[PDB]
Amino acid sequence: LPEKSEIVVIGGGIVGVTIAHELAKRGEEVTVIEKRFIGSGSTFRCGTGIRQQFNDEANVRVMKRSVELWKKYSEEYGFSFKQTGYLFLLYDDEEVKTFKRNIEIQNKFGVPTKLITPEEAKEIVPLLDISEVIAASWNPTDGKADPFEATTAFAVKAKEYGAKLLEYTEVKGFLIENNEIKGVKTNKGIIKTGIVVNATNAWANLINAMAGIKTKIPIEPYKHQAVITQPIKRGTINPMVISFKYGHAYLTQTFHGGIIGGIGYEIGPTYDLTPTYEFLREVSYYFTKIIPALKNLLILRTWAGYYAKTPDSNPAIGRIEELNDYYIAAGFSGHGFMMAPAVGEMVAELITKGKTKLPVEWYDPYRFERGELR
Amino acid sequence: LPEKSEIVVIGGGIVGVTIAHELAKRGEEVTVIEKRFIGSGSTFRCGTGIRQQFNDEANVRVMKRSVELWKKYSEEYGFSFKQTGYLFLLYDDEEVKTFKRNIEIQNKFGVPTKLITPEEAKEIVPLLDISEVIAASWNPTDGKADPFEATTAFAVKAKEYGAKLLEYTEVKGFLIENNEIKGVKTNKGIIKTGIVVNATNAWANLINAMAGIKTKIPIEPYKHQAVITQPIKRGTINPMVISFKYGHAYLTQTFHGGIIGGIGYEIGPTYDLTPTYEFLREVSYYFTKIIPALKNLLILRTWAGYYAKTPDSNPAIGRIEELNDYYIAAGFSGHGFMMAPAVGEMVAELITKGKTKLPVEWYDPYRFERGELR
Amino acid sequence: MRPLDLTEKRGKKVTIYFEGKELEAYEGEKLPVALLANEIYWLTTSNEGRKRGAFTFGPVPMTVNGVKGLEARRIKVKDGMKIERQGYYDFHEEEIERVVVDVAIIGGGPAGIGAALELQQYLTVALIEERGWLGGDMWLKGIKQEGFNKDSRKVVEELVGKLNENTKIYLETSALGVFDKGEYFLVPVVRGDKLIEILAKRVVLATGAIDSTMLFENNDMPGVFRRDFALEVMNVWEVAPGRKVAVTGSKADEVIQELERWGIDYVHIPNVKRVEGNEKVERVIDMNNHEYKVDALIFADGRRPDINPITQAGGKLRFRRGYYSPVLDEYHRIKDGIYVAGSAVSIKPHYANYLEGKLVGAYILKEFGYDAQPCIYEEKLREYEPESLSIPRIPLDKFNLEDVQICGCDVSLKKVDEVIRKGITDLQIIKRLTHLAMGFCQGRYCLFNGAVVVSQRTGKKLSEIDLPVARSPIKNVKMGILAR
Ligand SMILES: Cc1cc2nc3c(=O)[nH]c(=O)nc-3n(C[C@H](O)[C@H](O)[C@H](O)COP(=O)(O)OP(=O)(O)OC[C@H]3O[C@@H](n4cnc5c(N)ncnc54)[C@H](O)[C@@H]3O)c2cc1C
Ligand SMILES: Cc1cc2nc3c(=O)[nH]c(=O)nc-3n(C[C@H](O)[C@H](O)[C@H](O)COP(=O)(O)OP(=O)(O)OC[C@H]3O[C@@H](n4cnc5c(N)ncnc54)[C@H](O)[C@@H]3O)c2cc1C
Ligand SMILES: Cc1cc2nc3c(=O)[nH]c(=O)nc-3n(C[C@H](O)[C@H](O)C(O)COP(=O)(O)O)c2cc1C
Ligand SMILES: Nc1ncnc2c1ncn2[C@@H]1O[C@H](COP(=O)(O)OP(=O)(O)OP(=O)(O)O)[C@@H](O)[C@H]1O
Ligand SMILES: [Cl-]
Ligand SMILES: [Cl-]
Ligand SMILES: [Fe+3]
């Protein structure tokens, strides 16, 4: 347990460690404070990322960048990130028009997504039932990675670069002098610091409360769920397949051979985990509509995790001005794993230069009180 | 405990007893089976009804009729039903256009609702904040009554007319021979009958399950909540005031002097009661926007109850054909108390003549599997 | 000196007006106490015309400067103040803080302080108390007390004296209940008119017992004092209940000892049938029709755990030793993470409740990984057998029932008796038919009595008559305070 640290990042999930990682390789001294183990929490319950098919400039630029960092660090640290694509199945003119429009904006900013044909979609993913799919949105540079593998990797490098990662260490309060942060109070003593980063997404409020932040930054934990099937021949389902029409289903195959996935089925603001029978039924219905072979496959286990939701499904990433050297990177609303490498870069630059290459202001912490939802 | 009965109504809430009541005064022999006491359940947790301002012909005709029965039975049995009106506050042209349209349909079928002026709305209910209300929908023949008082009244008359009302008596199964009902199995023996009525709204599924009904009749219990304030001068808030804009707030004053009400705030399919802090906060915000004086008023208690919701917020009232002499009157989705006198009449006529004066077919049990939502 | 002053007050003198009359009061005094000192008892009338004071069950709405419906007990006296009586239902017509803490202790008596003392060795606690002082019921006594062989109020000073900066004290603060968010508990709290949200890992209910209410004829009339109120005015403020005082109930000695200390003359009436008088009490009549002239009646018939915070916290109840108690696991827990300590658990000496608070604080300290020794408190506690309470046989046949009041609001014993006579035995229904336990106490001072009546008329045993549970805001809060 250190007793002084230039920067203290709270939370040691993909986001927390990825931020530390950038700060540390940039020469800065960072210690992360995680109340359980590195990568417990949502990162531990997470799907397999990673996507550039978003619907607005900022997110598309951030994810384009993010994917570059996934390629770089993936091979540079040896942790495995397969670019198998993302496949959005479309079923009507409503959807086609909308995606034609999404792809257009994706393209402008260097994400070369194509609108594709049913039979093309079925070449990729031969087991896809193609009978009512009319087009599909396809990008071959989206991919999947194991959130735990990737976090642990970034973790050991961050340490190598000199970051302190503190594991069974919970933040409980702050020593705030004037509007200066002076220390982060924990269950194992106080650490002196002037700069802190809140990366606890689902718990963000708690950390905000302890800090006395009076700005409304609504981030609620919601229960989302996933299923895993028995393992299957390698490369049977390579890309992440999305079906908005069939219940916001997403499914793909794991590196073990599993076929993992969930659906939209959200359960109101709660910290409760524990899977539900209703999810079990619904996921089975949706998946087997999208790929019929799944009918013959054993379900092994089901689990749950938090989406840390904001009103506009975008994170709050920025400096909080009224507390001196408080930052927030939280509320990733279900897609925070894929963003992490890029938000690491952004937060580092904020701390370090006062501004960022990427359009970080889209994720303005102040947008909500100002009434400006994205 | 009887051992034979021509008709068995399951459930002794407002709906159950009101049905028995019609059957019995019509000369038929009915026994109701209630697992707790007459009027426990939603009727016990219910607001104060009673409204004819609906948005479609059937509901408007049914409620017009229903209100006639409220007037008749109210004075005839001495249970008190004040016609203080219902007041829908409107705030924009969006809403005005929509209600102009609702009122029009209300009028056609003999419900003389008026679109009215802000200052008019404030004459009725002097404490109304009128500053952003642009019109209000007003009908002076809507009213309020105590659901417990009214149920107990109908109850003692139903007995007087010869109905058997069985109180700590739970239905657990059915003796079904061919497709003939033969008996209703209970925790206190079996009762022989050929005709049964399911009036257990929130529990309807359970009763349907026991009956082996294979038709999809989706009725889910949802947690809705209410508040009561300290008593206040009589006639301070007379009509039921509704504000869609401020969170589907409804509030009115009780006969005791209370000021009772709730808001839209619905909690996903559950049998859980127990009020929540979040409701406490929200109701306080909404009410005090609509009538500011409420700010100085003490909140005394908060409680919860079931809405028995269907996908189209209309009940399932009809004969189930594949079980011989099974009927359903359940899923009133928050406004089943006001309907009760009329559904009593309808169900009686179904049992008794095979068809009804009112448009009962709007509430077709089969609509959901057929895909026909209202 | 005002006529009912027990001391000459040396606070800043101030002047107020009651119904036009000019009265002298002192700064910091609460409205009903200033009026008592000046021999004024009748402060309000109920909606059905019953005169009432401030020292028994029921609210005291008063017009305090043209502002109608303020609560007398909550109002501090202020120079130039214009005070008037009003109807019961007369109302006036016209920045949330978040604090995160390890435990959140609700209730600031010996149990609460006990817990806080144990806990602040290592943890940060909120000590929440609505009362304005930090003793408990203990601060109402000033008689030497067993356990800490030392004067009641001197012990409180010593104990409060020992509180860290690890303990945030919240005086004049009402907790609205407890809400489990899994990862923490939310205890929303009201102080002044600010709402404060306390997020804590653990909670302890150190919530106390409340004085039982005796059923006799005009038990609600001005100049009847419940035990706690009589002790408060005498010991906290220094004002007599009256010049000559009747005392009744099975714990009458506690009161008599205070009366004797202060040299206030009194009679001991073991069995009260009726109190009479125009504005205030002036006679009490016993069960043998003997009259006594007096200015006040003080009743002390035993305290019973306040079960509201328990059941809203989601705890379950047990009937034993003449009263309802929390069902606890082997660690004084109502439910995972919520501890119960003090006279909320059972009736016993102050010192015992003090130990129980330490006990409860030690368990949570152990939960947190610190090396605590809850068992030394455990074994000290066993030295104290929890007290019983006799169950009252209300002589229903011998009373004029419409004069004996069961709850604060309307609600005579007659109304309740009537519905029972018509077959209704379920308190759920009784609650609704009569308005018993729907008034601004939430049944605190009447539910148990209602149960006793059912039990008495029915033959049905009390250990079988289950009690309507406490709901959302366990304490009255208005309503503006809860937006946005
Ligand atoms: C079923 C499911 C599937 C998902 N699939 C995807 C996906 O395919 N792609 C994608 O991009 N995202 C996905 N997500 C979301 C993704 O998991 C999150 O966006 C991501 O994990 C956010 O990372 P984080 O580090 O911000 O949060 P977390 O991983 O939760 O890290 C926060 C950490 O802070 C710690 N903490 C909390 N309080 C304290 C305290 N007081 N002191 C110290 N530490 C504290 C916690 O212990 C926790 O480890 C999925 C989520 C779920 C639930
Ligand atoms: C907060 C709140 C406010 C409301 N306000 C209004 C309002 O203002 N106006 C309005 O019209 N409606 C209102 N409602 C809805 C209204 O309460 C219901 O529509 C109405 O009570 C339905 O009556 P019921 O008899 O169908 O249901 P219930 O009153 O629930 O009756 C069903 C009965 O069946 C019994 N039962 C269940 N299972 C069995 C079994 N196996 N054997 C025997 N008996 C069984 C139950 O014990 C129950 O008593 C409100 C509801 C809530 C929750
Ligand atoms: C019409 C109506 C009026 C009510 N009035 C009051 C009231 O004046 N005071 C009160 O404390 N509760 C009141 N309640 C709430 C009752 O206590 C209610 O039956 C309830 O709380 C349900 O029981 P539970 O909270 O124990 O689940 C009222 C409820 C209804 C439906
Ligand atoms: N909701 C609440 N909010 C704030 N304070 C409360 C609340 N409910 C009860 N209390 C307070 O809890 C305290 C209980 O202390 P009390 O002295 O009665 O019991 P104790 O500490 O167990 O020991 P003893 O009963 O022997 O004095 C009272 O001061 C009471 O005002
Ligand atoms: Cl998330
Ligand atoms: Cl309903
Ligand atoms: Fe009461």
Residue C289: CB atoms within 10 A of its CB come to: 8
Q: Give the whole-angstrom CA distance, residue B67 versus residue B209.
A: 34
Q: Give the whole-angstrom CA distance, residue C211 versus residue C206.
A: 16
**Terminal alpha carbon distance of chain B:** 41
The DSSP secondary-structure symbol of C141 reads: T
Chain C: residue nearest B296 by CA?
C478
Best C95, C96, C97, C100 residue to mutate vs chain A (most A CBs within 10 Å): C100
Q: Please tell me the residue having the least CA distance from ligand 4 atom 25.
A: C343
For B257, residues 6+ apart whose C-beta sits below 8 A from its C-beta are: B231, B232, B233, B234, C47, C89
Binding residues of A for FMN: 45, 301
The CA distance from A142 to the nearest CA of chain B, in Å, is: 35
For C311, residues 6+ apart whose C-beta sits below 8 A from its C-beta are: C317, C467, C469, C470
Q: Give the whole-angstrom CA distance, residue A201 versus residue A224.
A: 15
Q: What is the DSSP string of C18-56?
A: ETTEEEEEETT-BHHHHHHHTT----EE-TTS-EE-SSS
Buried b (16+ CB within 10 A) or exposed e, C444-478: bbbbbbbbbbbbbeeeeebeebebbbbbbbbbbbb
C60 closest CA partner among C220, C269, C232: C220
Q: Give the whole-angstrom CA distance, residue C190 versus residue B277.
A: 14
Q: How far is residue C385 CA from its own chain's centroid?
A: 23
Burial class (CB in 10 A: 0-12, 13-18, 19+), C132: middle
A47 closest CA partner among A260, A203, A220, A224: A260
Which amino acid, C464? E
Which amino acid, B133? V
Q: Are A338 and A308 in contact (CB under 8 A)?
A: no
C254 assigned to a ligand binding site: no
Which pair of structure tokens corresponds to residue C143?
């008689």
Q: Give the whole-angstrom CA distance, residue C45 versus residue C29.
A: 23
- Ligand 3 centre and the CA of C175: distance in Å? 21
The strand pair at A220-229 and A299-309 is best described as antiparallel
Q: Give the whole-angstrom CA distance, residue C297 versus residue C257.
A: 15
Which amino acid, A20? A
The CA distance from A107 to the nearest CA of chain C, in Å, is: 43
Residue C241: CB atoms within 10 A of its CB come to: 30
Domains A1-82+142-218+311-374 and A83-141+219-310 share a fold: no
Edge-first strand listing for the sheet containing B181-186:
B171-176, B181-186, B189-192
Q: Is the dihedral of CA C302, C307, C308, C313 positive or negative?
A: positive
Q: What is the DSSP string of B317-363?
A: EEEESSSBTEEEEE--TT-HHHHHHHHHHHHHHHHHHSS-SS-GGGG
Locate all alpha helices (DSSP H) within A212-309, ordered by sequence.
277-290
The CA distance from B11 to the nearest CA of chain C, in Å, is: 18
Q: Do B297 and C484 touch (CB under 8 A)?
A: no
Q: Give the whole-angstrom CA distance, residue C85 versus residue C49.
A: 13
Q: Are A141 and A67 in contact (CB under 8 A)?
A: yes
Q: Give the whole-angstrom CA distance, residue A192 versus residue A206.
A: 20
Q: Is A34 in the pocket of ligand 1 (CB under 6 A)?
A: yes
Q: Given A209, A212, A272, which is nearest C199 (Cβ)?
A: A209
Q: Give the whole-angstrom CA distance, residue A23 versus residue A163.
A: 8
Atom of ligand 1 lying closest to residue A144 CA? 8
How determined? X-ray
Q: Do B301 and C429 touch (CB under 8 A)?
A: no
Q: Which CATH number fits domain B83-141+219-310: 3.30.70.100, 3.60.15.10, 3.40.630.30, 3.30.9.10?
A: 3.30.9.10
Q: Given C93, C442, C483, which is nearest B284 (Cβ)?
A: C483
B62 assigned to a ligand binding site: no
For chain A, what is the largest distance between any 2 Cα atoms, rounded to a whole number of angstroms? 65
What's the Cα-to-Cα distance from A198 to each of A16, A204, A370, rounded to whole Å?
Answer: 8, 7, 21
Chains that touch B (3 or more CB pairs under 8 A): A, C
Q: How long a stretch of residues is chain B?
A: 374
Q: Give the whole-angstrom CA distance, residue C43 versus residue C61.
A: 8
Q: Give the whole-angstrom CA distance, residue C398 versus residue C287.
A: 8
For A203, residues 6+ apart whose C-beta sits below 8 A from its C-beta are: A11, A221, C183
The CA distance from B269 to the nearest CA of chain A, in Å, is: 10
Best A186, A219, A271 residue to mutate vs chain C (most C CBs within 10 Å): A271
Q: Give the whole-angstrom CA distance, residue B194 versus residue B177.
A: 10
Q: Are B251 and B291 in contact (CB under 8 A)?
A: yes
Buried b (16+ CB within 10 A) or exposed e, A65-96: bbbebbeebbeebebebbbbbbbbbbbeeebb
Atom of ligand 3 lying closest to residue B301 CA? 11
Report phi then psi at B323, rounded to 5.
-110, 130
Q: Give the whole-angstrom CA distance, residue A56 versus residue A36.
A: 35
For chain B, what is the largest distance between any 2 Cα atoms, rounded to a whole number of angstroms? 65
What's the Cα-to-Cα distance from C16 to each of B66, B152, C31, C55, C80, rounded to whole Å?
Answer: 58, 52, 10, 21, 5
* Degrees to nearest 5, angle at CA C29 with C23 and C35: 40
Q: Give the whole-angstrom CA distance, residue B308 versus residue B218.
A: 10
- Ligand 4 centre and the CA of C207: distance in Å? 4
Q: Are B284 and C479 in contact (CB under 8 A)?
A: yes
For C49, residues 6+ apart whose C-beta sits below 8 A from its C-beta are: none
Q: Give the whole-angstrom CA distance, residue C369 versus residue C363.
A: 10
Cβ < 6 Å from ligand 2: which residues? B 10-16, 33-36, 40-43, 45-49, 170-171, 199-203, 224, 226, 262, 305-307, 332, 334-338
Q: Are C110 and C138 in contact (CB under 8 A)?
A: yes
Which amino acid, C91? F
Helix (H, G, I), strand (E, B) or coil at C75: coil
Which amino acid, B92? D
Report phi then psi at C86, rounded to 5.
-160, 170
The DSSP secondary-structure symbol of C2 reads: -
B168 closest CA partner among B35, B295, B277, B52: B35
Q: Are B316 and B310 in contact (CB under 8 A)?
A: yes
Counting ligand 4 atoms within 8 A of each CB, the residue from C130, C189, C254, C306 with the most, and so the one to mutate, is: C130
Looking at the domain covering B1-82+142-218+311-374, what would its CATH class be? Answer: alpha beta
Residue B149: CB atoms within 10 A of its CB come to: 17
Burial class (CB in 10 A: 0-12, 13-18, 19+), B120: middle
Buried b (16+ CB within 10 A) or exposed e, C378-396: eebbeebeebebeebebeb
Q: Are B201 and B333 in contact (CB under 8 A)?
A: no
Q: Is the dihedral of CA A221, A222, A223, A226 positive or negative?
A: negative
Q: Are A190 and A183 in contact (CB under 8 A)?
A: yes
Which pair of structure tokens corresponds to residue C184?
């923490």
Q: Give the whole-angstrom CA distance, residue C399 versus residue C273.
A: 7
User: Which residues face C339 on adjacent strands?
Assistant: C204, C333
Residue with tokens 């702050």: A174
* Degrees to nearest 5, angle at CA A98 with A94 and A103: 145
Q: Where are the domains of chain B?
A: 1-82+142-218+311-374, 83-141+219-310
Q: Is C347 in the pocket of ligand 4 (CB under 6 A)?
A: no
Question: Which residues from B are below 8 Å from A268, CB to CB?
Answer: 267-268
For A316, residues 6+ apart whose C-beta sits below 8 A from its C-beta are: A204, A217, A219, A310, A328, A329, A330, A331, A363, A364, A365, A367, A368
Q: Is-cis flag, bond preceding B50, omega within 30?
A: yes
The CA distance from A268 to the nearest CA of chain C, in Å, is: 12
Say how many CB pairs under 8 Å bridge B and C.
107
Residue B331: CB atoms within 10 A of its CB come to: 27
Angle at which helix A14-25 crosses helix A336-353, to 10 degrees, equals 40
Q: Give the whole-angstrom CA distance, residue A186 versus residue A177.
A: 17
Q: Is C232 in the pocket of ligand 4 (CB under 6 A)?
A: no
C85 closest CA partner among C222, C234, C245: C222
Report phi then psi at B210, rounded to 5.
-65, -25
Report phi then psi at A86, rounded to 5.
-130, 140
Report phi then psi at B123, rounded to 5.
-65, -65
A168 — contact with chain C (CB < 8 Å)? no
C312 closest CA partner among C77, C469, C480: C469
Q: Give the whole-angstrom CA distance, residue C190 versus residue C176.
A: 7
The CA distance from B224 to the nearest CA of chain A, in Å, is: 14
For B157, residues 6+ apart whose C-beta sits below 8 A from its C-beta are: B21, B25, B77
Phi-psi region of C392 (alpha: psi -120 to 50; beta: other; left: phi over 0): beta
Q: Give the whole-angstrom CA distance, residue C418 versus residue C422.
A: 6
Q: Are C185 and C178 in contact (CB under 8 A)?
A: yes
Q: Are C341 and C205 in contact (CB under 8 A)?
A: yes
Q: Is B25 in the pocket of ligand 3 (CB under 6 A)?
A: no
Q: Are C349 and C145 in contact (CB under 8 A)?
A: yes
Q: Give the whole-angstrom CA distance, residue B147 versus residue B45.
A: 9
What's the Cα-to-Cα distance from B216 to each of B220, B365, B371, B374, C325, rounded to whole Å?
Answer: 12, 9, 11, 16, 47
Q: Give the whole-angstrom CA distance, residue B299 versus residue B296.
A: 10
For B344, residues 6+ apart whose C-beta sits below 8 A from its C-beta are: B15, B18, B19, B21, B22, B69
Q: Are C421 and C464 in contact (CB under 8 A)?
A: no
Which amino acid, A368? F
Q: What is the DSSP string of A141-174?
A: T--EE-HHHHHHHHHHHHHHTT-EEE-S--EEEE
The strand pair at C209-211 and C303-305 is best described as antiparallel
Report resolution (Å) to 1 decimal.
2.9
For B267, residues 6+ apart whose C-beta sits below 8 A from its C-beta are: A268, B222, B223, B224, B276
Burial class (CB in 10 A: 0-12, 13-18, 19+), A264: middle
Residue with tokens 């009036």: B199
Burial class (CB in 10 A: 0-12, 13-18, 19+), B6: middle
Q: Give the whole-angstrom CA distance, residue A155 versus residue A150.
A: 8
Which pair of structure tokens corresponds to residue B257?
């002097």
A153 closest CA partner among A82, A84, A70: A70
Counting ligand 3 atoms within 8 A of each CB, the residue from C308, C446, C471 with the most, and so the one to mutate, is: C471
| Kind and range of the H or E run holding C428 | helix C427-433
Residue with tokens 């604090």: C99
For B17, residues 6+ apart whose C-beta sits below 8 A from its C-beta are: B32, B38, B39, B151, B154, B155, B158, B165
What's the Cα-to-Cα distance from B44 to each of B75, B143, B148, B338, rounded to whole Å?
Answer: 22, 18, 6, 14
User: Which residues face A306 on adjacent strands?
Assistant: A223
Atom of ligand 2 lying closest to residue B250 CA? 8
Question: Which residues from A are below 8 Å from B268, CB to CB?
Answer: 267-268
Q: Give the whole-angstrom CA distance, residue B273 versus residue B15.
A: 21
Buried b (16+ CB within 10 A) or exposed e, B311-325: ebebbbbbbbeebbb
Helix (H, G, I), strand (E, B) or coil at A195: strand
- Ligand 3 centre and the CA of B123: distance in Å? 30
* Side-chain half-sphere exposure of B5, counting CA atoms within 13 A: 28
Q: Give the whole-angstrom CA distance, residue C458 versus residue C461.
A: 8
Which pair of structure tokens corresponds to residue C158?
């010593």
The DSSP secondary-structure symbol of B28 reads: -
Atom of ligand 3 lying closest to residue B147 CA? 1
Edge-first strand listing for the sheet containing A181-186:
A171-176, A181-186, A189-192
Q: Is-cis flag, bond preceding B116, omega within 30?
A: no
A206 — contact with chain C (CB < 8 Å)? yes
Helix (H, G, I), strand (E, B) or coil at B236: coil
- Ligand 2 centre and the CA of B37: distance in Å? 12
Q: Give the whole-angstrom CA distance, residue A6 versus residue A4.
A: 7
Q: Please tell me the residue having the least CA distance from ligand 2 atom 12.
A: B335
Which pair of structure tokens corresponds to residue B37?
């006491």
Residue with tokens 């039924």: A281
Q: Given C100, C181, C183, which is nearest A209 (Cβ)?
A: C100
Q: Given B40, B281, B303, which is nearest C482 (Cβ)?
A: B281
C299 closest CA partner among C262, C246, C232: C246
Q: Please tell me the residue having the least CA distance from ligand 3 atom 19.
A: B45
Nearest ligand, measured from the Cα of C207:
4
Q: Give the whole-angstrom CA distance, residue B261 versus residue B281.
A: 14
Q: Give the whole-angstrom CA distance, residue B366 versus residue B322.
A: 12
Q: Give the whole-angstrom CA distance, residue B295 versus residue B287.
A: 9
Q: Please tell me the residue having the least CA distance from ligand 1 atom 6.
A: A47
Residue ranges and CATH numbers for the domains of chain C are: 1-94 (3.10.20.440), 95-211+303-388+466-484 (3.50.50.60), 212-302 (no CATH), 389-465 (1.10.10.1100)
B23 closest CA partner among B203, B164, B148: B164
Q: Are B169 and B186 in contact (CB under 8 A)?
A: yes
The strand pair at B171-176 and B164-166 is best described as unpaired
Q: Are C446 and C434 in contact (CB under 8 A)?
A: no
